[PDB]
Amino acid sequence: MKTSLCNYSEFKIYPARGMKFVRGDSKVFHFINTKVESLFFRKINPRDIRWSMVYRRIYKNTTTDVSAK
Template sequence: MRLEKCWFCSSTVYPGHGIQFVRNDAKIFRFCRSKCHKNFKMKRNPRKVKWTKAYRRLHGKDMTQDATFEFERKRNRPERYDRNLTENTLKAIKVIDKVRSRRGEKHIQNRLKVRVAKDRKEAIKELDQQIHILIAPGATVKGASAATTSPKVPVKVQQESNENRMEE
């Protein structure tokens, strides 16, 4: 049983699943589901579509170089059946899977660390540039001192109120 990878999104295609397109130059394109097939027919580039593995790899979202990637590969040469070898392989698969998932998590955590530092830097910059939004232009240190020193000017209120009554 050979588990193929989807041409578009790089997910595993199990036997009996998905669809396969053979171009007239005998090139084979396998798709895991109709979503990927439709995207191929729309001539979309998997490197530019954000949900594909190809995009995630290219943009450093996923782990790219690791020793665990060397185990799973297309072997185009038949191997003689060996019971011990098969048993060991089945055991190794579990171990390797664990190691890979742990390293993948580590990669994501490292990515997030960079993000935190970047966010902090951006926040400081924004605070520097946008401080005038928080503090009104009259309420700066200079303005506040001026307001306290200047004497209060009395305003005649009664006259205004009289004018209003006349209008009514």
């Protein structure tokens, strides 16, 4: 497959990297890093985390353009 969005943040998951995780509720998630996996496990919202692109998206820093190149 081709490039995908992270489903925790809004990072570029290129097709050679990251981790896919499938829940029992039949939902799936990419994860650019283990760092974000950990966060997910914890239940720390990405709207807290300034490293995340959803934070940047919702507090306006023009991060959506670099996520579509």
